[PDB]
Amino acid sequence: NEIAAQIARQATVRPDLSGEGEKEEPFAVVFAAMGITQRELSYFIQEFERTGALSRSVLFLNKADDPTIERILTPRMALTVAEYLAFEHDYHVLVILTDMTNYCEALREIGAAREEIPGRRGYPGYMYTDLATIYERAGVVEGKKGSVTQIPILSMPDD
């Protein structure tokens, strides 16, 4: 979380080196949370308030007490908003997703409910496609000035 907040605070594009000369319009930020605790959420909120970035951010929060099956929808909505902003209002959107471990766990629970064919450790065999439908929404498009950037953060079990 510290590294993610520092990157959100210190992100610049350095146009002078590239020779573009274009003014650095500040990054728009979308922060999507999936099953984060209260201490982490409070930390993020004070960080954003202190750096003055809370007027440029859209917060999609799913606290740890929220239903699990809801965690399937949160990244989809967050990236929908990001794509809308970037490709129809010329923003440069920076998207961070709090813990894809929770997303994969919710996916596994609903899959085990549905009695799908498992994969390698009980995860559904279609988890690759499900994660790809989320990750592949980032990038740049020719003929437009907006862009979408992702730094999802996930904790490796057992390292």
Partner 1 sequence: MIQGVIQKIAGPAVIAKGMLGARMYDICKVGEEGLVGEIIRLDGDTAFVQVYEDTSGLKVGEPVVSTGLPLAVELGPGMLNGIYDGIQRPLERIREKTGIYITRGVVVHALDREKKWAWTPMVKPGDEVRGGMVLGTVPEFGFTHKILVPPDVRGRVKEVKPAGEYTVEEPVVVLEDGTELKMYHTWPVRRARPVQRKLDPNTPFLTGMRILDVLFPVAMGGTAAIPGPFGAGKSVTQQSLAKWSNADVVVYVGCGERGNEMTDVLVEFPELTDPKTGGPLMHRTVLIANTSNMPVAAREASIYVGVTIAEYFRDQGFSVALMADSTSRWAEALREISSRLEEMPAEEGYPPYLAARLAAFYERAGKVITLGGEEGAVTIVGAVSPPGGDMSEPVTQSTLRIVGAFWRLDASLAFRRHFPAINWNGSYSLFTSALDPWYRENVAEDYPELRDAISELLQREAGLQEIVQLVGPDALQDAERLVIEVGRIIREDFLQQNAYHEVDAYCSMKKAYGIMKMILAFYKEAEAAIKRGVSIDEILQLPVLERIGRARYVSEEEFPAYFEEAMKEIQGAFKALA
Partner 2 sequence: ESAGELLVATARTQARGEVLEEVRRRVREALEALPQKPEWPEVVRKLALEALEALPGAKALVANPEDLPHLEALARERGVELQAEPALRLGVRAVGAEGKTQVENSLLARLDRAWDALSSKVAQALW
Partner 3 sequence: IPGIRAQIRFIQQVLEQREREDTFRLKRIKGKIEAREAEEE
Residues binding partner 1 (CB under 8 A): 35, 37-39, 42, 63-65, 68, 87, 101-102, 105, 108-109, 111-113, 115-122, 125-126, 128-129, 132-133, 135-137, 139, 141, 155, 157-158
Instruction: In whole angstroms, give the CA distance from residue 74 to residue 8.
Output: 20
Least distance from C-beta 159 to partner 3, angstroms?
A: 12
**Quick one: what does residue 55 bind among partner 1, partner 2, partner 3, none, with the CB cut-off 5 to 8 Å set by partner type?**
partner 2
Supply the DSSP symbol for 49.
Answer: H
Q: Is 155 one of the binding residues for partner 2 (CB under 8 A)? A: no
**Pairing state of beta strands 147-150 and 28-32?**
unpaired
In three-state secondary structure terms, 55 is helix
Supply the DSSP symbol for 71.
Answer: G
Please, are residues 62 and 33 in contact by the beta-carbon 8 Å criterion? yes
Q: Is 52 one of the binding residues for partner 2 (CB under 8 A)? A: yes
Size (the chain), residues: 159
Interaction mask 54-73, partner 2, x per CB under 8 A: xx------------------
Which of 14, 23, 114, 120 lies at the binding interface for partner 3 (CB under 8 A)? 120
Q: Counting beta carbons within 10 angstroms of the beta carbon of residue 97, is it exposed (0 to 12), middle (13 to 18) or buried (19 or more)?
A: buried
Q: Applying CB under 8 A, which residues contact partner 3?
A: 115, 117-118, 120-122
